[PDB]
Write an enzyme that holds these catalytic residues in place. Structure first.
Site, PDB file in Angstrom:
ATOM      1  N   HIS A  61      27.249 -21.138  32.541  1.00 14.89           N
ATOM      2  CA  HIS A  61      27.477 -19.307  30.851  1.00 14.89           C
ATOM      3  C   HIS A  61      27.261 -18.150  32.193  1.00 14.89           C
ATOM      4  O   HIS A  61      27.964 -17.237  32.046  1.00 14.89           O
ATOM      5  CB  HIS A  61      26.666 -19.901  29.486  1.00 14.89           C
ATOM      6  CG  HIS A  61      26.792 -20.717  28.765  1.00 14.89           C
ATOM      7  ND1 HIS A  61      27.561 -21.206  28.389  1.00 14.89           N
ATOM      8  CD2 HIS A  61      25.452 -22.202  28.919  1.00 14.89           C
ATOM      9  CE1 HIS A  61      27.380 -22.505  27.977  1.00 14.89           C
ATOM     10  NE2 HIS A  61      26.506 -22.954  28.261  1.00 14.89           N
ATOM     11  N   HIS A  91      18.691 -13.021  33.603  1.00 18.49           N
ATOM     12  CA  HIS A  91      20.613 -13.178  34.301  1.00 18.49           C
ATOM     13  C   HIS A  91      21.704 -12.079  33.592  1.00 18.49           C
ATOM     14  O   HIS A  91      20.660 -11.017  33.105  1.00 18.49           O
ATOM     15  CB  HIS A  91      21.207 -14.021  32.890  1.00 18.49           C
ATOM     16  CG  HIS A  91      20.776 -14.205  31.398  1.00 18.49           C
ATOM     17  ND1 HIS A  91      19.118 -14.670  31.067  1.00 18.49           N
ATOM     18  CD2 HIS A  91      21.619 -12.903  30.881  1.00 18.49           C
ATOM     19  CE1 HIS A  91      19.663 -13.901  29.466  1.00 18.49           C
ATOM     20  NE2 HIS A  91      20.936 -13.047  29.438  1.00 18.49           N
ATOM     21  N   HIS A  93      25.350 -10.692  31.303  1.00 25.42           N
ATOM     22  CA  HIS A  93      26.357 -10.267  30.470  1.00 25.42           C
ATOM     23  C   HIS A  93      27.531  -9.473  31.490  1.00 25.42           C
ATOM     24  O   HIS A  93      27.527  -8.400  31.794  1.00 25.42           O
ATOM     25  CB  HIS A  93      26.459 -10.304  28.977  1.00 25.42           C
ATOM     26  CG  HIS A  93      25.059 -10.670  28.941  1.00 25.42           C
ATOM     27  ND1 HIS A  93      25.716 -12.898  28.090  1.00 25.42           N
ATOM     28  CD2 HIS A  93      24.359 -11.596  28.523  1.00 25.42           C
ATOM     29  CE1 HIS A  93      24.112 -12.824  27.999  1.00 25.42           C
ATOM     30  NE2 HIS A  93      23.652 -12.264  27.978  1.00 25.42           N
ATOM     31  N   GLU A 103      26.565  -6.676  26.165  1.00 26.62           N
ATOM     32  CA  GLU A 103      26.389  -7.077  25.033  1.00 26.62           C
ATOM     33  C   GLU A 103      25.872  -5.929  23.456  1.00 26.62           C
ATOM     34  O   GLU A 103      26.418  -6.078  22.507  1.00 26.62           O
ATOM     35  CB  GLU A 103      24.947  -7.951  24.574  1.00 26.62           C
ATOM     36  CG  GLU A 103      26.273  -9.140  25.798  1.00 26.62           C
ATOM     37  CD  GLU A 103      25.104 -10.787  25.513  1.00 26.62           C
ATOM     38  OE1 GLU A 103      24.108 -10.902  25.277  1.00 26.62           O
ATOM     39  OE2 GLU A 103      26.256 -11.964  24.853  1.00 26.62           O
ATOM     40  N   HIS A 116      19.294  -8.678  31.436  1.00 24.93           N
ATOM     41  CA  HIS A 116      18.532  -9.304  30.408  1.00 24.93           C
ATOM     42  C   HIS A 116      17.112 -10.260  31.143  1.00 24.93           C
ATOM     43  O   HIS A 116      17.422 -11.253  31.896  1.00 24.93           O
ATOM     44  CB  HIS A 116      19.031 -10.745  29.609  1.00 24.93           C
ATOM     45  CG  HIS A 116      20.055  -9.632  28.464  1.00 24.93           C
ATOM     46  ND1 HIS A 116      20.828 -10.759  27.700  1.00 24.93           N
ATOM     47  CD2 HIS A 116      20.213  -8.535  27.684  1.00 24.93           C
ATOM     48  CE1 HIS A 116      21.594  -9.631  27.007  1.00 24.93           C
ATOM     49  NE2 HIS A 116      20.808  -8.332  27.383  1.00 24.93           N
ATOM     50  N   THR A 195      21.407 -13.673  22.094  1.00 24.25           N
ATOM     51  CA  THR A 195      22.853 -13.424  21.939  1.00 24.25           C
ATOM     52  C   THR A 195      23.533 -15.034  22.509  1.00 24.25           C
ATOM     53  O   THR A 195      24.507 -14.485  22.374  1.00 24.25           O
ATOM     54  CB  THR A 195      23.237 -12.493  23.413  1.00 24.25           C
ATOM     55  OG1 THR A 195      22.828 -12.653  24.370  1.00 24.25           O
ATOM     56  CG2 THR A 195      21.707 -11.353  22.955  1.00 24.25           C
TER      57      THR A 195
HETATM   58  C1  LIG Z   1      17.139 -21.839  26.384  1.00 28.06           C
HETATM   59  C2  LIG Z   1      18.114 -20.308  25.896  1.00 28.06           C
HETATM   60  O1  LIG Z   1      17.370 -19.284  26.334  1.00 28.06           O
HETATM   61  C3  LIG Z   1      17.693 -18.170  26.207  1.00 28.06           C
HETATM   62  C4  LIG Z   1      19.347 -17.167  25.635  1.00 28.06           C
HETATM   63  C5  LIG Z   1      19.426 -16.253  25.164  1.00 28.06           C
HETATM   64  C6  LIG Z   1      19.061 -14.603  26.055  1.00 28.06           C
HETATM   65  S1  LIG Z   1      19.304 -13.591  26.268  1.00 28.06           S
HETATM   66  N1  LIG Z   1      21.157 -12.839  25.691  1.00 28.06           N
HETATM   67  O2  LIG Z   1      19.153 -13.218  24.786  1.00 28.06           O
HETATM   68  O3  LIG Z   1      18.355 -12.624  26.877  1.00 28.06           O
HETATM   69  C7  LIG Z   1      17.697 -15.663  27.008  1.00 28.06           C
HETATM   70  C8  LIG Z   1      17.195 -16.688  26.831  1.00 28.06           C
HETATM   71 ZN   LIG Z   2      21.505 -12.658  28.235  1.00 30.57          ZN
END
Ligand SMILES: CCOc1ccc(S(N)(=O)=O)cc1
Ligand SMILES: [Zn+2]
Ligand SMILES: CCOc1ccc(S(N)(=O)=O)cc1
Ligand SMILES: OC[C@H]1O[C@@H](O)[C@H](O)[C@@H](O)[C@@H]1O
Ligand SMILES: OC[C@H]1O[C@H](O)[C@H](O)[C@@H](O)[C@@H]1O
Length: 257
Positions: A61, A91, A93, A103, A116, A195
């Site tokens: 992803h 990470h 996006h 986002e 994020h 998200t």
């Molecule tokens: C286990 C999933 O953990 C997450 C998933 C999404 C996000 S976010 N994109 O909202 O920062 C953080 C942790």
């Molecule tokens: Zn995120």
């Protein structure tokens, strides 16, 4: 499985994750004129000097840079937060083009990407218990625009060729996330969700107003990653963002007058 394509993207997620239509989903559009300065917010404290990065992973992803969260090595406190939140991973996006990828949006503006930094509330002991709580997580969100290069991002960029496909990881020790911050910590905050699936409504969002600048060459290397696994047909990892969701019964607060 869920993803970002026409057949498994954000508009389909609600079928397996009905909270996708919930009351505090993220991201949202930040209407800057409606957001209100909140004098009750305490100073925000980003304390990353002892951070211990471990590894970088392509999870199909995005890519996650993972940290040792077995003690309070890198924490977020203050602002809207009660207590201490420990950094677990960051990470991004991003888009297929510079005109989209974030986002959150700001007065409907889309940035080229969004970082994020994910933290969990230490009162709950482990990330897994934290995501059962309405104040379990705090995500620090930082917009990326395309302009000058961000020197503190280059180490990330340069390792991406070693984690091109889903399921690949690489050692990523001694990375300092302080090099990803902008100068100002002015922010907006609101209660929301993850998200990505499972879309859990656990997050205090803290979205910095000042974007960081990254170069075109840097973001172009993000766009060379693959959603697919090794040996499978290439699907470029681009447009891995969820669009803005309904604000519903929420207010966005600003840290700045
Ligand atoms: C286990 C999933 O953990 C997450 C998933 C999404 C996000 S976010 N994109 O909202 O920062 C953080 C942790
Ligand atoms: Zn995120
Ligand atoms: C297989 O096809 C699927 C799998 C999961 C989803 S969702 N609801 O997680 O986006 C959609 C189609
Ligand atoms: O009742 C007045 C209050 O309304 C709330 O919706 C706002 O968040 C507060 O800032 C305001 O003082
Ligand atoms: O700091 C993150 C990484 O940056 C570069 O890839 C270095 O060569 C590597 O040793 C380090 O783990």
């Amino acid at each position: 499985h869920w993803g970002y394509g026409k057949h498994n993207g954000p508009e389909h997620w609600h079928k397996d994750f009905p909270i996708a239509k919930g009351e505090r989903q993220s991201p949202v559009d930040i209407d800057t004129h409606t957001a209100k300065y909140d004098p009750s917010l305490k100073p925000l404290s980003v304390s990353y000097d002892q951070a211990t990065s471990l590894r970088i992973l392509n999870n199909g992803h995005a890519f996650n840079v993972e940290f040792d969260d077995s003690q309070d090595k890198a924490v977020l406190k203050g602002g809207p937060l009660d207590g201490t939140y420990r950094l677990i991973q960051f990470h991004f996006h991003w888009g297929s083009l510079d005109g989209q990828g974030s986002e959150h949006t700001v007065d409907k503006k889309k940035y080229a990407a969004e970082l994020h930094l994910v933290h969990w509330n230490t009162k709950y002991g482990d990330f897994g218990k934290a995501v059962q709580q309405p104040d379990g997580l705090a995500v620090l969100g930082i917009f990326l625009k395309v302009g000058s290069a961000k020197p503190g991002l280059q180490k990330v960029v340069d390792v991406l060729d070693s984690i091109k496909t889903k399921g690949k990881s690489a050692d990523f020790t001694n990375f300092d996330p302080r090099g990803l911050l902008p100068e100002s910590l002015d922010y907006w905050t609101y209660p929301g969700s993850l998200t990505t699936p499972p879309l859990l409504e656990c997050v205090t969002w803290i979205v910095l107003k000042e974007p960081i600048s990254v170069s075109s060459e840097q973001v172009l290397k993000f766009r060379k990653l693959n959603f697919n696994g090794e040996g499978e047909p290439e699907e470029l990892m681009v447009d891995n963002w969820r669009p803005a969701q309904p604000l519903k019964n929420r207010q966005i607060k600003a840290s700045f007058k």
